[PDB]
Amino acid sequence: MKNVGFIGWRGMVGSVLMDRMSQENDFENLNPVFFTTSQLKSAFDIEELKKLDIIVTCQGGDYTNEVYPKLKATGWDGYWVDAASALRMKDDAIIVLDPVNQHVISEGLKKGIKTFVGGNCTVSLMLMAIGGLFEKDLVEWISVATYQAASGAGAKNMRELLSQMGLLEQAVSSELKDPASSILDIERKVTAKMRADNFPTDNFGAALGGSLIPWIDKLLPETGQTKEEWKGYAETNKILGLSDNPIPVDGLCVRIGALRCHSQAFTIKLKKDLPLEEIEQIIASHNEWVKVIPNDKEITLRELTPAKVTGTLSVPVGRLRKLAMGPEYLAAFTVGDQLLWGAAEPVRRILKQLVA
Amino acid sequence: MKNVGFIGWRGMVGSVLMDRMSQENDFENLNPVFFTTSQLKSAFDIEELKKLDIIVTCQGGDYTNEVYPKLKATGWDGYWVDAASALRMKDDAIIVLDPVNQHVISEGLKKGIKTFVGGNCTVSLMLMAIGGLFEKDLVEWISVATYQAASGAGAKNMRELLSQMGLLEQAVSSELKDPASSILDIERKVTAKMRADNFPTDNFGAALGGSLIPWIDKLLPETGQTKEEWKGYAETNKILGLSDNPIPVDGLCVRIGALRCHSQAFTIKLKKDLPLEEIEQIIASHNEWVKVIPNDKEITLRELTPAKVTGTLSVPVGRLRKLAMGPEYLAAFTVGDQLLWGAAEPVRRILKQLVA
């Protein structure tokens, strides 16, 4: 069995990885060595890390940027598996999402690539839902509008969202108890609390609770995009292996009041005019996790929501129809869990392949 | 002075209209006669309604479809102003949004049109923001993705959203107070509460607080669109007077956890390649309510959110840049209050013109 090092296993993404690995009994297939940054071996000890065959880290970019150059400088020929964004764009690294790019991964393992990194949450959840259209060379471009959860921002951000929500209802606790009260008065009090100084907004920089934030990560002055939006064009094409001739995937990334699921609204311009039934079969046949939801009200409310998909491996896609712009314009809406397919699952699955 | 009848003045839309009319001293220029459905004159007394010049109603479509044909059957030559969707698509009716379609209203007044109806909230808020692009005949098509507030569905829907928000936090109040508690444990509990039997989901048919619903209104079998989505293509073109040569406006209408502001994400395909600064000036110059928000983080978080715009007449539009698809593709994000420009304001303004 392989000797595997685990760093950042105590954090949010790391804990989801530990829980998933325990569920699938992945630990019986490898020899686990747990690391810690605390003053269990030290995560900064290159001499201990050098003994291992594979290193799995959910610690973050700052750690990766500090220890990865130092470790690869000793002549170490092992594998680096990362959940963080730091090494995604390097030429000796592959962005991993096996149900979509098993070919790129298999050909890369044959090429001697030692660094494997999980992809951007919104990109990976999009490809898990709409990868069938990419496989059959049907996508010309995709216009994206996201509904992102507090999960992607961090653990303290999820807690702030919850605190914000409770404070919004508390401001009108008494008024909500009697059915005869004025709704405009209720709203005036909820909005006043949202705008108050004592309303906890330090993690977001604005209220998320009964609002939204149409900006995620820093600005790239050259394009006007945010880093989260930029990753839609850059990472989709690297995963699929189309970096030399890219497919335009661009849009707006918005943070909404959800805990764990990222939802996305698409306007997909296809290369061919195809029947709607045929498009539904192309995306349903791609992988075992994608679930095509029929264009009906009761089934959409029950299946295509964060309430339904939180904590599951299911990637439902629905609202499938042709848009008024033309027969090659397809509407699609998807919901997926940020911590699983958007973070811990592509990392779990590549490890399984490496220890096989 | 003109004798004006007011029906549905005590409901949510009506109360906003009453407050706005009071703020602008609109009652000084007319003679108000208030009606009621309770057992003030009766709202169903056709003879009392006939004695009036103009009738402004916020009561709803069920009232209109009952009282309107009975009133027109007496030979009444007065004006009907409605906030309800019932008569929007009728040939003898005009949809009002004067800062965008004053010409259609002015020509309609001269032709002898007696019925003026307020438009669909999302369509109205979209046109208030990017009406400049439509004015200059620059729009080929628009793909929409909305972030709709609970006020669009009703007063009890807003109450249900708030009650839901409180229950989600109350489920983890001790854990949130504990700075060292597990986030995975916190999430497991709020998600369990969201899925519980006693969680209030009566008005929406699903959870909204901590989630979203990608379906608003009835299905339109012919296209696959929901009625809210259909109103995009149909109403934008009736407002602008372009029903003979329509501009495609289509997309996905999603309900999120906001109280009274609808936010919208667009991918606008323009007819010509124009510099960004010119497009920003074309958008800004259209009306005095639209506000172009520069593509900066601090300014976007402070200005382009439901938190900032709630209860105001301001219609901010930002995140303006060219998309990766090409220089004729424009990204834009807007936020607007549903009860004002999306409900009471276009009704308030048309009345002001009729009583002049």
XYZ file of C-alpha atoms in Angstrom:
712
model
C 0.000 0.000 0.000
C 0.937 3.630 -0.616
C 2.069 6.035 2.144
C -0.262 9.054 2.116
C 0.110 12.371 3.938
C -2.923 14.423 4.957
C -2.674 18.168 5.672
C -5.637 20.423 6.559
C -7.846 17.451 7.423
C -9.330 19.387 10.383
C -10.737 22.275 8.289
C -14.169 22.419 6.605
C -13.163 20.928 3.192
C -10.775 18.501 4.918
C -13.475 17.283 7.332
C -15.856 16.571 4.425
C -13.003 14.586 2.786
C -12.384 12.629 6.022
C -16.113 11.899 6.386
C -16.434 10.754 2.738
C -13.292 8.612 2.857
C -14.540 6.922 6.061
C -17.905 6.255 4.377
C -16.276 4.517 1.387
C -13.612 2.807 3.548
C -10.812 4.422 1.507
C -8.452 4.240 4.497
C -8.144 0.436 4.279
C -6.543 0.875 0.820
C -3.702 3.168 1.997
C -1.331 3.896 4.919
C -2.476 7.292 6.382
C -0.034 9.719 8.031
C -1.754 12.742 9.565
C -0.038 16.137 9.738
C -0.610 19.312 11.763
C 0.551 22.946 11.590
C 0.358 23.065 15.414
C 3.348 23.034 17.790
C 0.849 13.804 14.509
C 3.859 15.171 12.606
C 4.728 18.728 11.502
C 3.331 19.895 8.142
C 6.419 22.114 7.677
C 8.931 19.237 8.125
C 10.143 18.535 4.558
C 12.150 15.509 5.762
C 8.953 13.754 6.921
C 6.942 14.780 3.826
C 9.725 13.393 1.560
C 9.131 9.839 2.878
C 5.572 9.760 1.439
C 4.315 8.643 -1.996
C 1.253 10.940 -2.119
C 0.364 14.171 -0.265
C -3.285 15.240 0.023
C -3.813 18.840 1.180
C -6.921 20.893 1.973
C -4.855 23.460 3.924
C -4.903 26.301 1.394
C -2.842 28.271 -1.103
C -0.508 29.969 1.436
C 0.752 26.586 2.690
C 1.091 25.170 -0.824
C 3.107 28.193 -1.977
C 5.488 27.777 0.987
C 6.151 23.991 1.213
C 5.554 22.750 -2.400
C 8.648 24.509 -3.916
C 10.810 23.358 -0.957
C 9.652 19.727 -1.319
C 10.013 19.499 -5.137
C 13.502 21.021 -4.695
C 14.769 17.938 -2.809
C 14.192 15.686 -5.830
C 10.936 14.122 -4.529
C 9.062 12.131 -7.194
C 5.740 11.681 -5.364
C 2.212 12.958 -6.045
C 0.719 16.243 -4.830
C -3.075 16.310 -4.510
C -4.481 19.750 -3.698
C -7.949 21.234 -3.110
C -6.668 24.861 -3.245
C -6.342 27.100 -6.345
C -2.567 27.785 -6.114
C -1.251 25.251 -8.643
C -4.224 24.873 -11.024
C -2.756 26.853 -13.921
C 0.822 25.438 -13.828
C 1.947 23.431 -16.899
C 2.982 20.378 -14.852
C -0.405 20.240 -13.074
C -3.749 18.778 -14.133
C -7.136 20.055 -12.955
C -9.097 16.988 -11.814
C -12.762 16.023 -12.375
C -12.631 12.337 -13.438
C -16.242 11.710 -14.653
C -15.616 14.546 -17.157
C -11.866 14.303 -17.889
C -10.716 10.705 -17.208
C -8.884 10.767 -20.556
C -6.771 13.886 -19.702
C -5.928 12.304 -16.310
C -5.009 8.850 -17.748
C -2.841 10.432 -20.475
C -1.261 12.731 -17.887
C -0.407 9.834 -15.543
C 1.291 8.192 -18.559
C 3.119 11.516 -19.246
C 4.588 11.615 -15.723
C 2.481 14.451 -14.226
C 2.901 14.484 -10.443
C 0.587 17.370 -9.457
C -3.207 16.905 -9.427
C -5.535 19.711 -8.327
C -9.303 19.916 -7.755
C -11.211 22.525 -9.762
C -13.177 25.699 -9.017
C -16.490 24.850 -7.406
C -18.814 26.527 -9.925
C -16.840 25.114 -12.911
C -16.862 21.516 -11.612
C -20.575 21.577 -10.685
C -21.380 23.003 -14.156
C -19.405 20.245 -15.924
C -20.958 17.488 -13.772
C -24.365 18.670 -15.005
C -23.668 19.761 -18.571
C -20.606 17.663 -19.547
C -22.613 15.604 -22.055
C -22.939 18.602 -24.378
C -19.158 19.115 -24.152
C -18.401 15.427 -24.851
C -20.484 15.442 -28.044
C -18.781 18.709 -29.226
C -22.076 20.654 -29.080
C -21.134 23.787 -27.080
C -20.207 27.010 -28.936
C -20.481 29.197 -25.791
C -22.183 29.421 -22.346
C -23.605 32.491 -20.562
C -23.578 31.932 -16.778
C -25.455 33.545 -13.858
C -24.633 31.958 -10.513
C -26.431 31.736 -7.161
C -23.485 30.932 -4.863
C -23.587 29.644 -1.284
C -21.730 30.999 1.789
C -19.811 27.675 1.815
C -17.399 28.830 -0.890
C -16.439 31.908 1.117
C -15.639 30.021 4.333
C -16.841 28.535 7.633
C -17.167 31.923 9.414
C -19.144 33.236 6.440
C -21.790 30.490 6.859
C -22.102 31.407 10.566
C -22.457 35.102 9.678
C -25.235 34.311 7.171
C -27.123 32.386 9.886
C -26.641 35.155 12.490
C -27.819 37.731 9.908
C -30.988 35.692 9.161
C -31.901 35.300 12.847
C -31.427 38.998 13.506
C -33.740 39.874 10.573
C -36.628 37.861 12.016
C -35.901 39.003 15.612
C -36.369 42.663 14.661
C -40.027 41.775 13.886
C -40.583 38.805 16.264
C -43.721 40.296 17.869
C -45.176 41.668 14.598
C -44.923 38.262 12.872
C -46.922 36.616 15.701
C -50.153 38.486 14.918
C -51.653 38.013 11.399
C -53.293 41.477 11.374
C -50.009 43.458 11.449
C -48.851 45.704 8.578
C -46.405 44.033 6.173
C -44.881 47.400 5.184
C -44.100 48.139 8.860
C -42.560 44.646 9.211
C -40.367 45.289 6.144
C -39.335 48.792 7.351
C -38.043 47.231 10.582
C -36.243 44.302 8.849
C -34.505 46.703 6.428
C -33.537 49.090 9.275
C -31.803 46.176 11.068
C -30.043 45.144 7.828
C -28.667 48.704 7.499
C -27.725 49.111 11.204
C -24.162 49.387 12.575
C -24.551 46.357 14.882
C -25.605 44.063 11.997
C -22.689 41.538 11.571
C -21.207 42.126 8.104
C -17.448 41.805 8.777
C -16.925 38.530 6.853
C -18.882 39.590 3.753
C -18.450 43.370 3.740
C -22.202 43.634 3.145
C -25.442 41.933 4.203
C -26.114 38.539 2.644
C -29.009 37.551 4.923
C -31.949 39.191 3.152
C -29.933 40.393 0.167
C -27.209 39.279 -2.313
C -23.645 40.237 -3.311
C -22.875 40.413 -7.107
C -19.099 40.244 -6.615
C -16.955 37.238 -5.592
C -13.102 37.518 -5.246
C -10.748 40.261 -6.654
C -10.997 42.206 -9.947
C -8.785 41.478 -12.989
C -8.348 45.050 -14.417
C -7.638 43.659 -17.906
C -11.016 42.003 -18.482
C -13.282 43.526 -15.833
C -14.048 40.026 -14.526
C -13.716 38.881 -10.917
C -11.400 35.866 -10.266
C -14.420 33.613 -9.722
C -15.880 34.627 -13.122
C -12.463 34.307 -14.853
C -12.149 30.686 -13.681
C -15.203 29.876 -15.813
C -13.226 30.456 -19.041
C -9.776 29.352 -17.830
C -10.569 26.216 -15.815
C -13.353 24.729 -18.012
C -10.951 24.654 -20.939
C -8.036 23.230 -18.915
C -10.229 20.396 -17.487
C -11.434 19.456 -20.998
C -8.000 19.924 -22.625
C -9.077 22.746 -24.987
C -6.635 25.468 -23.759
C -5.177 26.015 -27.256
C -8.675 26.622 -28.806
C -11.007 27.792 -25.908
C -14.807 27.642 -25.591
C -16.276 30.927 -24.211
C -17.788 30.413 -20.767
C -18.455 33.751 -19.058
C -20.989 35.450 -16.838
C -21.734 36.908 -13.422
C -20.967 35.277 -10.074
C -23.399 36.216 -7.309
C -23.377 35.227 -3.649
C -26.877 34.496 -2.261
C -28.281 33.410 1.105
C -27.731 29.631 0.856
C -25.467 27.444 3.061
C -23.877 24.707 0.917
C -25.198 24.601 -2.644
C -24.140 26.585 -5.682
C -26.928 26.998 -8.224
C -26.376 28.183 -11.793
C -28.555 29.594 -14.594
C -27.330 28.918 -18.142
C -28.005 30.121 -21.677
C -26.096 27.592 -23.790
C -25.558 28.268 -27.494
C -25.280 24.905 -29.222
C -23.594 24.198 -32.583
C -26.527 22.163 -33.996
C -30.352 22.322 -33.897
C -31.368 19.153 -32.038
C -34.688 17.902 -30.523
C -35.172 18.676 -26.795
C -35.602 14.950 -25.979
C -32.218 14.203 -27.605
C -30.437 16.948 -25.598
C -31.956 15.582 -22.344
C -30.639 12.103 -23.207
C -27.130 13.432 -24.053
C -26.746 15.069 -20.604
C -28.375 12.199 -18.661
C -26.076 9.575 -20.266
C -22.821 11.368 -19.306
C -22.476 10.253 -15.655
C -24.434 8.506 -12.859
C -24.769 11.657 -10.685
C -26.475 14.001 -13.175
C -30.268 13.884 -12.800
C -32.503 15.417 -15.496
C -35.502 17.051 -13.833
C -38.688 17.255 -16.000
C -39.969 20.758 -16.841
C -42.900 20.543 -14.395
C -43.657 22.757 -11.342
C -44.142 20.233 -8.501
C -41.124 18.125 -9.535
C -38.913 21.256 -9.940
C -39.811 22.538 -6.425
C -39.120 19.085 -4.944
C -35.911 18.276 -6.866
C -34.091 21.371 -8.245
C -33.358 23.218 -4.943
C -30.495 23.615 -2.353
C -32.945 22.204 0.261
C -33.045 18.897 -1.691
C -29.407 18.534 -2.786
C -27.440 19.677 0.329
C -25.083 16.925 1.504
C -25.773 14.605 -1.472
C -23.749 13.591 -4.554
C -26.736 14.345 -6.825
C -26.337 17.022 -9.510
C -29.853 17.830 -10.796
C -30.308 19.836 -14.003
C -33.691 21.054 -15.172
C -35.609 23.953 -16.717
C -34.526 22.556 -20.096
C -36.086 24.271 -23.125
C -35.248 26.278 -26.232
C -35.001 30.052 -25.746
C -36.807 32.728 -27.833
C -33.475 33.679 -29.496
C -33.352 30.545 -31.634
C -33.490 26.687 -31.714
C -29.747 26.464 -30.926
C -30.188 28.447 -27.673
C -30.756 26.180 -24.634
C -31.961 27.193 -21.151
C -30.729 25.103 -18.196
C -30.637 25.485 -14.413
C -28.560 23.277 -12.079
C -28.016 22.763 -8.310
C -24.981 21.039 -6.755
C -23.283 20.738 -3.344
C -20.177 22.974 -3.110
C -18.338 20.836 -0.513
C -18.711 17.529 -2.373
C -18.334 17.725 -6.194
C -17.150 21.289 -5.866
C -14.368 20.443 -3.377
C -13.834 17.067 -1.636
C -15.080 14.493 -4.195
C -12.627 15.149 -7.084
C -9.818 14.987 -4.497
C -11.184 11.724 -3.003
C -11.554 10.044 -6.423
C -8.062 10.864 -7.751
C -6.566 9.457 -4.507
C -8.538 6.212 -5.045
C -6.961 5.966 -8.552
C -3.439 6.694 -7.242
C -3.619 3.998 -4.526
C -5.287 1.428 -6.849
C -60.811 68.481 -10.630
C -61.105 64.852 -11.793
C -63.195 62.374 -9.785
C -60.992 59.329 -9.128
C -62.048 56.002 -7.611
C -59.587 53.902 -5.585
C -60.067 50.131 -5.148
C -57.641 47.855 -3.289
C -55.975 50.820 -1.590
C -55.538 48.884 1.710
C -53.522 45.926 0.336
C -49.706 45.851 -0.066
C -49.430 47.432 -3.569
C -52.278 49.814 -2.712
C -50.689 50.975 0.567
C -47.394 51.735 -1.258
C -49.413 53.725 -3.870
C -51.244 55.615 -1.065
C -47.963 56.438 0.696
C -46.315 57.596 -2.581
C -49.297 59.736 -3.624
C -49.309 61.325 -0.138
C -45.553 62.003 -0.324
C -45.968 63.767 -3.691
C -49.227 65.564 -2.667
C -51.126 63.980 -5.599
C -54.466 64.218 -3.765
C -54.321 68.032 -4.100
C -54.937 67.732 -7.856
C -57.875 65.262 -7.721
C -61.107 64.298 -5.922
C -60.567 60.882 -4.213
C -63.466 58.478 -3.682
C -62.440 55.357 -1.755
C -64.083 51.957 -2.228
C -64.353 48.770 -0.143
C -65.357 45.099 -0.531
C -66.397 44.907 3.159
C -69.930 45.017 4.612
C -67.098 54.356 1.920
C -68.987 52.965 -1.095
C -69.075 49.357 -2.407
C -66.404 48.193 -4.910
C -69.076 46.128 -6.703
C -71.632 48.986 -6.960
C -71.394 49.571 -10.738
C -73.601 52.694 -10.547
C -71.266 54.468 -8.082
C -68.192 53.578 -10.142
C -69.873 54.979 -13.301
C -70.113 58.492 -11.752
C -66.280 58.704 -11.887
C -63.735 59.870 -14.495
C -60.829 57.545 -13.626
C -60.670 54.259 -11.670
C -57.352 53.181 -10.124
C -57.326 49.574 -8.927
C -54.752 47.472 -7.035
C -57.345 44.862 -5.962
C -56.328 42.138 -8.425
C -57.226 40.286 -11.610
C -60.275 38.456 -10.195
C -61.943 41.799 -9.378
C -61.056 43.301 -12.765
C -62.364 40.377 -14.871
C -65.657 40.660 -12.926
C -66.229 44.452 -12.575
C -64.466 45.847 -15.700
C -66.752 44.274 -18.396
C -69.859 45.182 -16.335
C -68.731 48.821 -16.074
C -67.868 49.138 -19.791
C -71.327 47.634 -20.494
C -73.052 50.703 -18.993
C -71.388 52.868 -21.672
C -68.879 54.461 -19.236
C -66.316 56.509 -21.167
C -63.798 56.937 -18.335
C -60.236 55.726 -17.752
C -59.209 52.447 -16.106
C -55.811 52.299 -14.400
C -54.767 48.846 -13.178
C -51.853 47.306 -11.285
C -53.149 43.778 -12.106
C -52.035 41.586 -15.046
C -55.574 40.811 -16.314
C -55.872 43.377 -19.142
C -52.192 43.777 -20.141
C -52.411 41.902 -23.448
C -55.760 43.333 -24.638
C -55.728 45.406 -27.873
C -57.527 48.395 -26.312
C -55.041 48.472 -23.410
C -51.571 49.979 -23.029
C -48.862 48.939 -20.579
C -47.387 51.974 -18.777
C -43.781 52.789 -17.858
C -43.518 56.482 -18.867
C -39.753 57.131 -18.481
C -39.329 54.422 -21.166
C -42.535 54.581 -23.262
C -43.996 58.128 -23.037
C -44.378 58.182 -26.847
C -46.529 54.985 -26.834
C -48.676 56.477 -24.045
C -48.997 59.945 -25.684
C -49.976 58.457 -29.059
C -52.269 56.013 -27.282
C -54.000 58.878 -25.442
C -54.572 60.718 -28.760
C -55.921 57.543 -30.438
C -58.512 57.224 -27.659
C -57.138 54.390 -25.435
C -59.009 54.274 -22.107
C -57.214 51.396 -20.353
C -53.732 51.828 -18.824
C -52.110 48.901 -17.030
C -48.902 48.618 -15.003
C -46.310 46.152 -16.287
C -44.629 42.984 -15.028
C -42.191 43.851 -12.290
C -39.033 42.251 -13.736
C -39.694 43.685 -17.230
C -40.247 47.188 -15.787
C -37.121 47.113 -13.608
C -35.046 45.820 -16.569
C -36.235 48.640 -18.863
C -35.640 51.278 -16.161
C -32.003 50.125 -16.006
C -31.031 49.380 -19.627
C -33.698 51.419 -21.437
C -30.976 53.529 -23.069
C -29.765 50.541 -25.082
C -33.320 49.960 -26.334
C -33.840 53.669 -27.105
C -30.818 53.744 -29.438
C -31.878 50.491 -31.246
C -28.751 48.686 -30.005
C -30.325 45.489 -28.625
C -30.528 42.313 -30.759
C -31.495 40.064 -27.800
C -31.252 39.680 -23.981
C -30.810 36.483 -21.956
C -32.094 36.992 -18.393
C -31.442 35.287 -15.025
C -33.410 36.767 -12.131
C -33.037 36.914 -8.348
C -36.642 37.636 -7.349
C -37.981 38.864 -4.038
C -40.861 37.419 -2.006
C -42.962 40.620 -2.385
C -43.697 39.634 -5.969
C -45.624 36.612 -4.729
C -47.430 38.353 -1.846
C -47.527 39.762 1.717
C -47.898 36.326 3.378
C -44.952 35.097 1.271
C -42.708 37.789 2.787
C -43.886 36.716 6.275
C -43.167 33.056 5.464
C -39.640 33.961 4.302
C -38.895 35.828 7.555
C -40.320 33.045 9.775
C -38.190 30.539 7.834
C -35.017 32.634 8.386
C -35.586 32.794 12.144
C -36.233 29.059 12.506
C -32.981 28.272 10.644
C -30.868 30.301 13.076
C -32.924 29.307 16.176
C -32.124 25.673 15.349
C -28.427 26.475 16.059
C -28.507 29.448 18.517
C -26.299 27.761 21.179
C -23.814 26.469 18.585
C -23.450 29.938 16.981
C -22.831 31.541 20.406
C -19.990 29.017 20.890
C -16.975 30.368 18.871
C -15.315 26.914 18.773
C -18.281 24.826 17.540
C -18.307 22.588 14.436
C -19.655 24.171 11.228
C -20.533 20.729 9.780
C -22.655 20.130 12.919
C -24.248 23.588 12.605
C -25.139 22.957 8.945
C -26.536 19.427 9.673
C -29.010 21.021 12.075
C -30.244 23.947 9.936
C -30.628 21.585 6.947
C -32.586 19.139 9.134
C -34.899 22.002 10.206
C -35.347 23.083 6.578
C -36.492 19.530 5.712
C -38.722 19.058 8.793
C -42.543 18.696 8.662
C -43.216 21.778 10.831
C -41.032 24.097 8.682
C -43.500 26.672 7.145
C -43.498 26.063 3.368
C -47.251 26.573 2.696
C -47.068 29.724 0.562
C -44.062 28.745 -1.583
C -44.465 24.971 -1.756
C -40.763 24.675 -0.867
C -38.201 26.408 1.371
C -36.941 29.868 0.378
C -34.871 30.951 3.380
C -31.486 29.262 2.978
C -32.467 28.112 -0.525
C -34.084 29.197 -3.827
C -36.939 28.202 -6.157
C -36.271 28.167 -9.980
C -39.954 28.353 -10.929
C -42.348 31.328 -10.655
C -46.014 31.069 -11.847
C -47.820 28.610 -14.191
C -46.191 26.610 -17.023
C -46.754 27.679 -20.644
C -46.816 24.233 -22.449
C -46.006 25.630 -25.923
C -42.588 27.059 -25.049
C -41.611 25.481 -21.735
C -41.413 28.942 -20.152
C -43.203 29.841 -16.913
C -45.718 32.750 -17.135
C -43.144 35.038 -15.455
C -40.543 34.088 -18.075
C -43.059 34.428 -20.954
C -43.909 37.989 -19.863
C -40.315 38.889 -20.720
C -40.765 38.527 -24.505
C -44.432 39.580 -24.572
C -44.400 42.655 -22.305
C -41.032 44.232 -23.246
C -42.274 44.466 -26.823
C -45.771 45.765 -25.996
C -44.272 48.463 -23.697
C -41.812 49.645 -26.377
C -44.399 49.435 -29.188
C -42.359 46.769 -31.025
C -44.911 43.894 -31.223
C -44.674 43.951 -35.059
C -40.863 43.367 -35.072
C -40.043 41.779 -31.623
C -36.707 41.774 -29.785
C -36.013 38.377 -28.099
C -35.960 38.638 -24.269
C -35.850 35.244 -22.531
C -34.399 33.412 -19.544
C -34.890 31.920 -16.086
C -36.931 33.455 -13.275
C -35.714 32.372 -9.835
C -37.112 33.234 -6.401
C -34.495 34.031 -3.721
C -34.531 35.085 -0.061
C -34.954 38.852 -0.521
C -37.900 40.940 0.783
C -38.775 43.554 -1.869
C -36.035 43.914 -4.493
C -35.669 42.033 -7.749
C -32.105 41.636 -8.986
C -31.294 40.588 -12.556
C -28.237 39.293 -14.437
C -28.069 39.904 -18.208
C -26.015 38.946 -21.259
C -26.986 41.611 -23.790
C -26.170 41.044 -27.465
C -25.652 44.411 -29.110
C -26.075 45.269 -32.816
C -22.745 47.128 -32.935
C -19.306 47.113 -31.266
C -19.131 50.231 -29.076
C -16.528 51.274 -26.412
C -17.537 50.512 -22.777
C -17.508 54.186 -21.704
C -20.066 55.042 -24.433
C -22.435 52.197 -23.395
C -22.205 53.417 -19.764
C -23.153 56.958 -20.863
C -26.022 55.676 -23.083
C -27.439 53.715 -20.091
C -27.028 56.622 -17.605
C -28.534 59.362 -19.836
C -31.905 57.604 -20.309
C -33.635 58.579 -17.031
C -32.882 60.256 -13.653
C -33.422 57.051 -11.605
C -30.891 54.764 -13.297
C -27.455 54.889 -11.667
C -24.348 53.404 -13.343
C -22.202 51.751 -10.666
C -18.478 51.556 -11.616
C -16.916 48.053 -11.743
C -15.102 48.272 -8.370
C -15.588 45.968 -5.318
C -16.190 48.498 -2.506
C -18.667 50.504 -4.615
C -20.524 47.376 -5.880
C -20.984 45.949 -2.332
C -22.275 49.320 -1.086
C -24.443 50.207 -4.102
C -25.570 47.184 -6.197
C -27.548 45.209 -3.573
C -31.170 44.804 -2.302
C -29.820 46.157 1.038
C -29.067 49.560 -0.537
C -32.024 49.930 -2.907
C -34.972 48.725 -0.741
C -37.702 51.383 -0.525
C -35.966 53.809 -2.922
C -36.727 54.908 -6.487
C -33.112 54.247 -7.521
C -32.355 51.644 -10.209
C -28.604 50.860 -10.083
C -26.924 48.970 -12.939
C -23.344 47.748 -12.746
C -20.842 44.965 -13.491
C -20.681 46.385 -17.036
C -18.036 44.717 -19.231
C -17.636 42.878 -22.526
C -18.028 39.107 -22.289
C -15.549 36.501 -23.607
C -17.927 35.633 -26.500
C -17.062 38.856 -28.299
C -17.134 42.715 -28.191
C -20.897 42.851 -28.959
C -21.766 40.820 -25.817
C -22.402 42.910 -22.685
C -22.660 41.777 -19.044
C -24.891 43.839 -16.748
C -26.321 43.439 -13.266
C -29.239 45.476 -11.917
C -31.227 45.819 -8.671
C -34.639 47.474 -8.275
C -37.478 47.738 -5.739
C -40.420 45.542 -6.819
C -43.121 47.590 -5.060
C -42.088 50.937 -6.575
C -41.050 50.809 -10.286
C -42.290 47.261 -10.425
C -45.768 48.072 -9.026
C -46.989 51.394 -7.565
C -44.886 54.011 -9.392
C -45.983 53.479 -13.041
C -49.593 53.564 -11.781
C -48.987 56.768 -9.728
C -47.451 58.557 -12.744
C -50.083 57.683 -15.355
C -52.745 58.933 -12.921
C -50.780 62.229 -12.569
C -50.950 62.717 -16.371
C -54.681 61.844 -16.548
C -55.606 64.367 -13.820
C -53.436 67.207 -15.229
